[PDB]
């Protein structure tokens, strides 16, 4: 009620307060509890191997220096008071570019408690690197992590734990990635040892499964239909040299046009992707089909037998190629 | 233990401290030891001729002004105390854009020692230029360097050395470039003389070898198959004017479509790349194949002999072209 009385209490807490010194300095390490409320996962970039995350990052710790008496309320102070208070040197190890929103003000919350408990909340948009194994692409499963660690203070000075156990991270179900689906999320607490010493570590990992629907319609179906369209040449009479030859290269031309567009949307990974194997395999089949007519024309100038053998073999071989390919990557 | 006693000690060190003056001012140059812990190499851009590097940059030096007694501990202070302490004017000569991460705070570490030793660590994401010799592209080897130098202080005032010898730089093995492989890294210490005087220099260089797997499948194989597909015209009977002519330009059309997509991913370098020579060479062969049928049709209206000579020569010449090309660039 008495604003002046509250003002005097806050000034008393800040008087002589040393931001440079952690709570319980020279004593037991301060336990910091962290909970994360995910707002959204804006982007997941395969070319840059990173994802953009927006979240409400909150930290809980006890500072006896900030304990106050006579005020049975939780003091929600202005965000500018955080500059006069000690906060953990929490940083993300795998982040590439992060910032705190400042509209209309810095999205920062300081909430004090009579016993000295401090609540520190930040709305952070971060871009964290995520190495992706694209061997099974686009049927791959990705495990993107978010590493949380103290920069300077070791385990002797500070400790990290998930506040609420497995409930420390919420809002996962609200995430709606156009290309991925959040299979599962895991919370890991561990200690990482460096040359300077051991540091506390908190890890938040998402298992992302890519949606196959877009690629099946966009990429696989045109490739299959062109390859089937190449088999039409076998039905065409052997004397129709102009027709069968024109069917050949145009199918080859069509396959190249499909191949040029598809490979652009991905980084240059030396290993063979599932999409890489399928596109090249189809391009070989149409290449062999035109070669098949070459042999037919040459021997003609048994010729029916070669065409008949080609007709039985090609759909069977392509079906066998599809069966082996799908089983390998599924 | 006594936070007030530690606070008084820190205030005593900062009292009368002059940030404008280096340690041992007017005396022997201050030796600064540097060690780098690489976090990741995010990007390597051929078009911009630069790479993005994230690392933990640490500096070691002795400042007798900051020596303290009676506290047998290493004081890990808040990162904001670095503004009140002298730090070397270390800058990167070849960098194009660099910044220090500030989430949740400035990724900066200050660690004092009783004898006056100061540890200054920074997590820096830097974009450093790297001139690339692309004559042997994509079978080229690149030597990208990171130049470390003092801006204002000469060798008379400051000196640089790698702390730990060849172990000063770590984390190289963890780097996973999708397009390159880290063959080797080297540490170089030298003095660079300018008009204003001689300055200490530290150089960190990476030898990058490009992965050839992506380009072999994406670019070379389609070009080879189209050229082989053009040789099919020789088997086709000479009277099939519509078939052989249609095979010719369509192969030429296919080669142009491949050429248009491939050259986009690279800067305009006047010299001939290995990929440049191969694409143009294949385009000449298909051009000659259609010219070959022109001569055949004209003389027909020996004609069999011209086709037979063409059949022997073309695969042999193309194989010879491939053999010379691969030996030159491997």
């Amino acid at each position: 009620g008495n604003m002046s009385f509250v003002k005097e209490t806050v000034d008393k807490l800040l008087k002589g307060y040393d931001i440079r010194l952690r709570p319980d300095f020279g004593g037991p390490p301060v336990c910091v509890g962290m909970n994360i409320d995910i707002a959204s996962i804006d982007m997941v970039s395969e070319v840059n191997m990173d994802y953009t995350l927006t979240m409400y990052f909150q930290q809980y710790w006890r500072d006896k220096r900030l304990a106050y008496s006579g005020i049975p309320l939780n003091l929600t102070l202005d965000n500018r008071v955080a500059d006069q208070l000690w906060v953990p040197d929490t940083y993300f190890l795998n982040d590439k570019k992060s910032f705190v929103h400042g509209v209309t003000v810095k999205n920062r919350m300081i909430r004090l408690h009579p016993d000295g408990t401090v609540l520190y909340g930040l709305r952070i948009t971060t871009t964290a690197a995520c190495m992706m194994d694209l061997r099974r692409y686009p049927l791959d499963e990705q495990n993107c992590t978010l590493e949380i660690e103290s920069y300077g203070y070791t385990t002797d000075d500070i400790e990290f734990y998930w506040r609420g156990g497995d409930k420390a991270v919420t809002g996962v179900e609200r995430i709606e990635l156009p290309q991925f689906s959040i299979v599962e999320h895991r919370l890991v607490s561990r200690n990482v040892v460096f040359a300077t010493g051991a540091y506390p570590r908190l890890s938040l990992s998402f298992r992302l499964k890519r949606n196959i629907g877009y690629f099946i319609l966009q990429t696989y179906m045109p490739s299959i239909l062109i390859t089937i369209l190449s088999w039409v040449s076998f039905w065409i009479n052997y004397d129709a040299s102009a027709a069968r030859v024109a069917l050949g290269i145009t199918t080859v031309l069509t396959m190249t046009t499909i191949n040029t567009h598809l490979r652009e949307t991905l980084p240059k990974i030396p290993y063979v992707k599932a999409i890489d194997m399928y596109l090249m395999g189809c391009f070989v089949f149409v290449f062999l089909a035109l070669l098949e007519y070459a042999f037919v024309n040459y021997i003609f100038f048994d010729v029916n037998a070669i065409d008949r053998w080609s007709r039985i073999v090609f759909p069977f071989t392509f079906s066998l190629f599809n069966l082996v390919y799908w089983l390998y990557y599924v | 233990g006594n936070m007030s006693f530690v606070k008084e000690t820190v205030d005593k060190l900062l009292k009368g401290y002059d940030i404008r003056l280096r340690p041992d001012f007017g005396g022997p140059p201050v030796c600064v030891g540097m060690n780098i812990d690489i976090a990741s190499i995010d990007m390597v851009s051929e078009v911009n001729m630069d790479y993005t590097l994230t690392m933990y940059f640490q500096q070691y030096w002795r400042d007798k002004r900051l020596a303290y007694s009676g506290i047998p501990l290493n004081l890990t202070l808040d990162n904001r105390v670095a503004d009140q302490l002298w730090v070397p004017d270390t800058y990167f000569l070849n960098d194009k854009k660099s910044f220090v991460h500030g989430v949740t705070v400035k990724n900066r570490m200050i660690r004092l020692h009783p004898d006056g030793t100061v540890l200054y660590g920074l997590r820096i994401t830097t974009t450093a230029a790297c001139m690339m010799d692309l004559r042997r592209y994509p079978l080229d080897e690149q030597n990208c360097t990171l130049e470390i130098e003092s801006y204002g202080y000469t060798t008379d005032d400051i000196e640089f050395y790698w702390r730990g010898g060849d172990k000063a730089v770590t984390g190289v093995e963890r780097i996973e470039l999708p397009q390159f492989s880290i063959v080797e890294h080297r540490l170089v210490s030298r003095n660079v003389v300018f008009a204003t005087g001689a300055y200490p220099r530290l150089s960190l260089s990476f030898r990058l070898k490009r992965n050839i797997g992506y380009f072999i499948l994406q670019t070379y194989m389609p070009s080879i198959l189209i050229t082989i597909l053009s040789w099919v015209s020789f088997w086709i009977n000479y009277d099939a004017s519509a078939a052989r002519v249609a095979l010719g330009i369509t192969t030429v059309l296919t080669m142009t479509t491949i050429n248009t997509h491939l050259r986009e991913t690279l800067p305009k370098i006047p010299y001939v790349k290995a990929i440049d020579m191969y694409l143009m060479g294949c385009f000449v062969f298909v051009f000659l194949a259609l010219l070959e049928y022109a001569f055949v049709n004209y003389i027909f209206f020996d004609v069999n002999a011209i086709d037979r000579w063409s059949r022997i020569v073309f695969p042999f010449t193309f194989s010879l072209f491939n053999l010379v090309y691969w030996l030159y660039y491997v």
Partner: nanobody
Amino acid sequence: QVQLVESGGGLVQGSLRLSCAASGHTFNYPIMGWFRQAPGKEREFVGAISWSGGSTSYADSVKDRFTISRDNAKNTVYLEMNNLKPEDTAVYYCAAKGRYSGGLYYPTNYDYWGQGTQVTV
């Protein structure tokens, strides 16, 4: 989950090649390190290699004598030991390290460990 099995370590007085087979989500643990634990002593670092890339790191005691190589297709890490010395009598272990597990020299940072082969020379 990663399962590590190491083999190829016998009793000799010499060049030896130790192979460590891996199975599971090996991509999430791209760094493989070799550790030996002499009786009455703490487990000692030998050499740590990455599954991808192939860059190497070795301890000073075994530098230029032990060489390690790996191949992702085989999913196996091969440790080649040459010029054996009597101090090399320890149980050799194969361990996998997460990408963000910190320092290589500390066995605590490694999550999955092999059974351990007893080699006496």
